[PDB]
Amino acid sequence: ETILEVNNVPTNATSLMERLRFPVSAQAGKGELCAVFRADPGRNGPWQSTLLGQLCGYYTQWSGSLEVTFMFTGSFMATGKMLIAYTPPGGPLPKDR
Amino acid sequence: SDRVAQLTIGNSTITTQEAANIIVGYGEWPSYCSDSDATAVDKPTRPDVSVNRFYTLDTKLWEKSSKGWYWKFPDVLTETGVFGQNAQFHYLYRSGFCIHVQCNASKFHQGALLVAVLPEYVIGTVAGGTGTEDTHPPYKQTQPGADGFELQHPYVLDAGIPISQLTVCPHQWINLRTNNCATIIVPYINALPFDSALNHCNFGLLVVPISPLDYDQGATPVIPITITLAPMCSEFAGLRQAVTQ
Amino acid sequence: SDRVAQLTIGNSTITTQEAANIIVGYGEWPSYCSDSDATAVDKPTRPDVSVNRFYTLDTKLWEKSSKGWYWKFPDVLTETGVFGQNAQFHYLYRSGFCIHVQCNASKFHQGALLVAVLPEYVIGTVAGGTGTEDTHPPYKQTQPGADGFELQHPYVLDAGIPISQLTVCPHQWINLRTNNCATIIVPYINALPFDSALNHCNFGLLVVPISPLDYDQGATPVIPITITLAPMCSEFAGLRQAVTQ
Amino acid sequence: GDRVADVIESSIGDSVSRALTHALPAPTGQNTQVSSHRLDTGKVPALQAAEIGASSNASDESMIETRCVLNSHSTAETTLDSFFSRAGLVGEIDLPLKGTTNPNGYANWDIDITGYAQMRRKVELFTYMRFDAEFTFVACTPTGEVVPQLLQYMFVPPGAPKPDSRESLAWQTATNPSVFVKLSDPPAQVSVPFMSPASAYQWFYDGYPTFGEHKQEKDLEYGACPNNMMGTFSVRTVGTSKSKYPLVVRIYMRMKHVRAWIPRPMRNQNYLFKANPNYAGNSIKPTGASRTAITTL
Amino acid sequence: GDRVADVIESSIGDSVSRALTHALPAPTGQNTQVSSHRLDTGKVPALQAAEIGASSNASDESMIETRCVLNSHSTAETTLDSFFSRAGLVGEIDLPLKGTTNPNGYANWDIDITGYAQMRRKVELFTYMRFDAEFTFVACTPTGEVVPQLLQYMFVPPGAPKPDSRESLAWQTATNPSVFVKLSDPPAQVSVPFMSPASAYQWFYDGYPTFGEHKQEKDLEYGACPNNMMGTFSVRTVGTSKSKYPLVVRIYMRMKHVRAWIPRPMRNQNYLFKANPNYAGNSIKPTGASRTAITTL
Amino acid sequence: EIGASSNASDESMIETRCVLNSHSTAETTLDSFFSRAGLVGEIDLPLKG
Amino acid sequence: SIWYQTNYVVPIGAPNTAYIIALAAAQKNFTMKLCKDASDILQTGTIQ
Numbered sequence A: 001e002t003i004l005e006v007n008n009v010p011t012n013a014t015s016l017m018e019r020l021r022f023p024v025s026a027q028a029g030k031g032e033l034c035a036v037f038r039a040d041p042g043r044n045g046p047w048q049s050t051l052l053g054q055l056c057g058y059y060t061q062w063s064g065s066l067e068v069t070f071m072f073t074g075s076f077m078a079t080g081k082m083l084i085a086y087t088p089p090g091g092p093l094p095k096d097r
Numbered sequence B, C: 001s002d003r004v005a006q007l008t009i010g011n012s013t014i015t016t017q018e019a020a021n022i023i024v025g026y027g028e029w030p031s032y033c034s035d036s037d038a039t040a041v042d043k044p045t046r047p048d049v050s051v052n053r054f055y056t057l058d059t060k061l062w063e064k065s066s067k068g069w070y071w072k073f074p075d076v077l078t079e080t081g082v083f084g085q086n087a088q089f090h091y092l093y094r095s096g097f098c099i100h101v102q103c104n105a106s107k108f109h110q111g112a113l114l115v116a117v118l119p120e121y122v123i124g125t126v127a128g129g130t131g132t133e134d135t136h137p138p139y140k141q142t143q144p145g146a147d148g149f150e151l152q153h154p155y156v157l158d159a160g161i162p163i164s165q166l167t168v169c170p171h172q173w174i175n176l177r178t179n180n181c182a183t184i185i186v187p188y189i190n191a192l193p194f195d196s197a198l199n200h201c202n203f204g205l206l207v208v209p210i211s212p213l214d215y216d217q218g219a220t221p222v223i224p225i226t227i228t229l230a231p232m233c234s235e236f237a238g239l240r241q242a243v244t245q
Numbered sequence D, E: 001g002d003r004v005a006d007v008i009e010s011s012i013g014d015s016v017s018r019a020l021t022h023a024l025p026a027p028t029g030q031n032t033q034v035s036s037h038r039l040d041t042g043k044v045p046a047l048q049a050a051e052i053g054a055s056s057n058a059s060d061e062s063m064i065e066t067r068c069v070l071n072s073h074s075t076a077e078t079t080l081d082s083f084f085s086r087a088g089l090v091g092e093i094d095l096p097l098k099g100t101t102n103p104n105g106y107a108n109w110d111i112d113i114t115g116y117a118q119m120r121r122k123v124e125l126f127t128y129m130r131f132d133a134e135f136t137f138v139a140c141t142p143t144g145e146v147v148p149q150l151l152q153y154m155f156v157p158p159g160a161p162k163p164d165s166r167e168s169l170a171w172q173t174a175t176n177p178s179v180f181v182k183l184s185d186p187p188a189q190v191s192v193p194f195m196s197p198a199s200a201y202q203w204f205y206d207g208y209p210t211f212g213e214h215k216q217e218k219d220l221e222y223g224a225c226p227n228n229m230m231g232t233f234s235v236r237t238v239g240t241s242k243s244k245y246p247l248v249v250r251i252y253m254r255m256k257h258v259r260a261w262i263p264r265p266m267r268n269q270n271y272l273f274k275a276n277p278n279y280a281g282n283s284i285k286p287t288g289a290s291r292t293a294i295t296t297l
Numbered sequence F: 001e002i003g004a005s006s007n008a009s010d011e012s013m014i015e016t017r018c019v020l021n022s023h024s025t026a027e028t029t030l031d032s033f034f035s036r037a038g039l040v041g042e043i044d045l046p047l048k049g
Numbered sequence G: 001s002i003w004y005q006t007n008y009v010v011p012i013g014a015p016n017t018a019y020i021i022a023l024a025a026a027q028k029n030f031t032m033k034l035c036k037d038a039s040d041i042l043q044t045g046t047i048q
C-alpha cells in the first residue's frame, strides 16, 4: 500500500502535502457526500500518487481486484460511521447516498 | 470479541466496533418454505445475492425531544432495488430480515433507544379524542414507506398497548455509553407460507428513546439514527405484470 | 410427430401443429458460464423462472410489398418484465434464447419468410447515396427496441452483404404451404464470458420475405407475424443502481 | 445437472429452520441448591448488559447464600388450555317483541368475539391462535325467566344465504348445521372445529384485504382479514306468527386444544370498537396506580 | 445445505454446453460407393424440406446409379491456416520530403488492417478470429529505389506516448519494442502474438463502447470496440536533420495459428470506409453477372 | 499503523463465485521488465565543430 | 464514493475536523501484461 491522493486539488508548492489526506467533520445528518474518485488505477487522477499506479504505467493491460484502506486520524474521542461505495461500470456518479 | 462484528451478505459488508451481540428473533433463523408447508404450485424464483443484501434506507435525527419512529416490513423496501422489482412483479413473497440500526455519539453523550420488532403491528387512532369517532389511520400512516412515521403517543404505541412490555418482542437497546448499534435477525412470520408484500406488512420496526438524549453545550448536537436492513432467503411466486399497490 | 410441438418454459407454454422441427444454433445448447471461462469474481444471480420464460413482444403485418424487418438481442427485452429489470440493475449479463416466430395463413395463401439469426449484426448506411458521405446509423436504428426496424435494402441486409448467403446462419423458413412458425435456439455468442446488455447486441433476428405473400381477392388480407422469445440460462453480475442506457 | 461451484456449495433451498433453543420438561418449579459465599475476581453473575436483549441469567444461588429447597409446586395451571379453556361471554342476541332492533322474531349475529373486554384482552395476548371450541347458548327472557318457547339456531358460513325473516326459505337448513332447542331445555352446546383457511386465526392483521388505492372511504377495511370471518349465527323463534315473549340469547365460548404464537403487550387502554385498537386520545391513562413521589410509598 | 425438491432437481449452474455434433477426421474427399436401381415406396431420398433449416442429405448414390470411386483428393489446402497464412498488404506509410502529410520525417500508423480490400474481405468471412501474425516491412523510395538510409520502427501500445516529431523523447524506446533497419537490408520481419484483452478479435461489433446517450455527434463510435485497437506503429528516419530521400513503407501481414468462429455472408458491395460497412446507396449492384432472360444462356 | 498492508480479501468482503485464474505473472519478472534495449548514450563525431 | 452514514461526533474539547489517509494496492489475483513505456518522460532538455 502507498498513499492515494484522493484530495488531488491543491497545486501550489506549499500546499502539496495536503493532497495526502482529506477531511471529515461534524455535519447536519443529511447523509452528505464526503469525497469521490474513479477506481481506474492506470488513469490520470488520484492513483497516480501510488506505486501501483506508476508500475501500472509500464503495462498495457491489467487484471485483478484492488483494495483501498482508509485510516482515520482524528482524536480518540471522535466517533462516526461512513459508507464507502464502489459503483461498477455503467452507473453514473451517485446523486445521493 | 462480542463488541466487534462484521455482517457480510451479497455485495455488502457492515462493521461495528461497539456491538452488543446479535438477537435471533424467537430463536430461529430464516429458512425457505418447505414442500409440505407450501401450497402454491408454481416453481418460485429465489434471486439470491441481488435481493438478499443490505439496503440503507433512512436516517432520522435524534433530538432531546424525539418521540420515536416506526417502519413497516416489507413496505420499506417495496420500491427499492431488485428486491422491490420482484415484490411488484410477483403476487407471492416471503423472506426473513437482518436489521441493523446505527447510532453513535461520544463518551460524553447519553441516552438509550429501545429497538424492537413487533409482528402484525396494527395502528390505531385516537378516535376523535373523545373516543366516540370511529376514525381509521390513512394509508400513509399504516404503510409509511422508507421515511417511516413518528409516533404520536409512544406510551401506548399508537395502538392502546404499553410500550413498557414491548421487550416481550425481539429487541436490543442502543445505550450510548455501551454500544452504537442493534442487530436483530427475524425469520418469516405469518400464518400463511407466502403472502403479498404489498397488502400485508409482517412486522413493524420500532426505534423509541426511553432515556432521552443529552449532552452539554458544545458537543456535536446532530446525532443521526440510520436504518440498514437485508432480506434473507427471499422467495417469490405468482408472476405477472408489475403492480405498486 | 415433427410437425407438432410444445415449448414450455417458466409459466409459459407454446403449441404449434405445423412446425418444421427445431434448429439449435451452431449445434449447441445454452449453458451457464463455467468457473474457468469466467473472470468477474462476484457471485452471479440466476433468477431462473422469473426471467427465462416466453415474452411476446411485437406483431408486424406481412404485405405483398413488405421488405423485411430485424430486431436486436438483448435490446428487444431490456425494458420488459423481470428480465429487463435485471439487465438494468446489472452491468454484466449473459443468456441464450429460444426464438419462436409465428405466422399462419390458409391453404390458399402463399409466400415464404426466411427467419435467421446473425451475430454481431452491424448496420451500415447508404453513405449519402454517392458514397462520399461518412454517415452513421442513429441509435434508434442500431437498437430499435421491441418495435424492430424495417430494412431499407434487404438485398444487402443494410450492411453491404448478400442476403442470398444469410442461410450460413442458424435459420428456418416459414413457407405458408408447409409450416406456420420457426423455432431457433441460440446459445450465448460473444468473445467475452459476460457483457453489457445495454451497450452490446449479441445478434440480430431477421425476418425477410423472399417469396412474396399472395392470395386472391376475398381471402383474409391481414397476415400478422408475431415474435415470441425466451431467455435461457440468464445470469447477471456487477450489481448497482438501475440504468437504461 | 449442476456444475459451477457456487451452485453446488449453495444453501438456497434449505427448508429446515435451525432453532437456537429447545423445550424441556418442567412440571414443577425449579429447586434451590445450597450455595455458600464466593469471594472471587473474574466471576461476576450480578453484572449484566440489558442492551443485548436477553433477560438476566443471575440466580438466587449466586446472589445470596441459599439453603436447599425441594420445590414441587406444579406448573400445570399456566398451560394455554388451562388459561383459555374456561367459558366466557362473547356474544349476546336480543329478540324483542315491539322494539327498535329485531322486532321480526329472528336475528343474525356476526361471529366475532371481540365485543367483550374480558375475553378479548386474554386472547389478544397472542398474535396467532389455532383452536377448537365449545359454544354454549343460554336463553331466557330479559328478567331471567324460562318460558315454553322453541328456537332454531343455524350456522351460516360465508356464502350461504342469510335468513331475512322468521319465515325465510333458508331455515330449511338442508346443509347448514342447525340446532332446535326449547328455552326450558338445558343450554344448547356444541363443538366447533378450527375453520380458518389459514393455519391460525390472528387477532391482528397489519394490512389490507385487497389490492388497489387505499383511499379515505376504504380505510374501514384496514386490518380486516377474511381468514378471521367464520360467518353468521342466526336465530329465530320457530313459527309463522310472532312469539309471545321477548328473548335474550347469551353466547359462551370455551376454547380447547389451543396453540398460540407471538406474544404481545397486553391492552392497557379501554376498548372502543371491535374492529380495531382505537383508544380515546383525551383519556390516555397510565397502565397502573400512581403515587406522589418516588421516595414515598 | 439444500432441502426443497425443486432446488435439488435443478439444472441451474450446468456449465457443460451440450453439443449436438462432433468433428471427424476428413483428410480426403469422400469416396463413392457402388449403387444400383431402387424401385421403392416409402424410401424417398430426393424429397426434402428446406424449411427445417438443414441442407439436403441426398447423396450421389441414391439419385443415380454410381460406380465405386476411391477418392484421395486432399482437404489440406482449405484449412484456416492454409487460407490465411499468406502475406498480404495491410498498410502503407509515406515519408515525403516537401509534402502535405508527413514533411517532418516521421509517421504514426494506426494498427488497423481494414484499409485494403483483398485482405479485409477474407477476414470478414468470420465474426471472431484469434491468431498470431508475422509482419514484414518493405521500404523503398517512390520509384522502388533502395537508398542508404536508416529507419526506426516502434510499436506504441495504447497508453504509451506517441512520438510527435523525428526527435521525440519517446524514441528512447526503453520498454516499447523497436526495430532499427537500413533500406538496403532485406525487409524487416517479426512475430506478433495475440494481444487482445478479449479471447478473440472481432471484425464486427454491434454496439457502443461506452454508456450514456448516443446522440448524433457520438454515432461515429457505433461499432467501435477497443478490444480490436492494438495501438500505433511509428516510423522515423533516424536523425536530427531531414532525410535526403522520400520513403514509402509497405506493411504485409501473414496470420498463423488461426482460429475462427461464426461464418457470415461475404462482402458484395465496394468498401468505402475502414470503420464501417457503409456502401454507396446509389450504386447497389447485384452480387454477380446478369443475363437478358431466364431461359437463355 | 502496524506498517503492513491489508490482509482482507475479496472472499470476505462480498459474496464471490469461483474463478479459475490462469493469467500469467511472467511478464513482470525483473528480466522481462528490464531486458529491453533502450538508449543510454549518444556520441557525436562532427567535422568542423 | 464516500458518504456520512451517521455523523462525525465529538465531545467538548476535541477538534471538529479530522483527516483520513487512503492507502491503496492490488489483491493477489492482480497481474499485468504487454510491457510498454510509461506516459511520462521526466526530462526537458538534455540531462547534463
Ligand SMILES: CCO/N=C/c1ccc(OCCCCCN2CCN(c3ccncc3)C2=O)cc1
Pocket (backbone or CB within 6 Å): D111, D112, D113, D114, D135, D153, D154, D155, D177, D178, D179, D190, D192, D201, D202, D203, D204, D228, D230, D233, D274
Ligand atoms: C347449529 C349452529 O351451531 N353452531 C354454532 C357455532 C358457533 C361458533 C362458530 O364459529 C365460532 C368461531 C369463533 C372464531 C372467533 N374468531 C376467530 C378470530 N376472530 C377475530 C375477530 C376479530 N378480529 C380478528 C379475529 C374471531 O372472532 C360456528 C358455529
Ligand SMILES: CCO/N=C/c1ccc(OCCCCCN2CCN(c3ccncc3)C2=O)cc1
Pocket (backbone or CB within 6 Å): E111, E112, E113, E114, E135, E153, E154, E155, E177, E178, E179, E190, E192, E201, E202, E203, E204, E228, E230, E233, E274
Ligand atoms: C518493432 C515494432 O514491430 N512491431 C510491429 C507490429 C506489427 C503489428 C502489431 O499488431 C498487429 C495487430 C493486428 C491486429 C489487426 N486487427 C485486429 C482486429 N482488427 C480490427 C480492425 C477494424 N475493425 C475491427 C477489428 C484489426 O485490425 C504490433 C506490432
